[PDB]
Amino acid sequence: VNTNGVESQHTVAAYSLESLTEAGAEFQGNYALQGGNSYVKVENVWVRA
Amino acid sequence: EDGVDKAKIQEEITQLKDQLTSIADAASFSGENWLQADLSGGAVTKSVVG
Asked: May I ask which residue range the UniProt record assigns to the signal sequence (chain A)?
């Protein structure tokens, strides 16, 4: 993920899709809205957005 | 070459395209052929346990 015009490497915790869908999460495309927290899919894993 | 008829070459390329499709779909090992992937998301990634 590039914060600016230059690219960079970042480490972020990943959340399983089953954990999100178990707690009653709304979905739209690559968006999850389980609760107050919002999750998005970057390539294959859901991370906090 | 304009003097060469284009129809014969047309079925030649048709056969070659069918051959390419056969190569693309047949070349699989255990269901993960690493080819003909679904690009709906456009970022499909496959990994090997290192």
From this structure: none
Contacts of A41 in chain B (CB under 8 A): 41
Whether the CB of B26 is below 8 Å from some CB of chain A: the reply is: no
**Closest to A39 in 3D by CA, of A16, A22, A5:** A16
Are residues B45 and A30, on separate chains, in Cβ contact within 8 Å?
A: no
Structure-solving method:
cryo-EM
Cβ of A46: how many Cβ atoms within 10 Å? 22
Are the CB atoms for B28 and B37 separated by under 8 Å? no
| Chain A residues closer than 8 Å to B44 by CB | 44
Query: In units of Å, what resolution does this entry have?
Result: 3.5
Instruction: For residue A26, list its beta bridge partners.
Output: A33
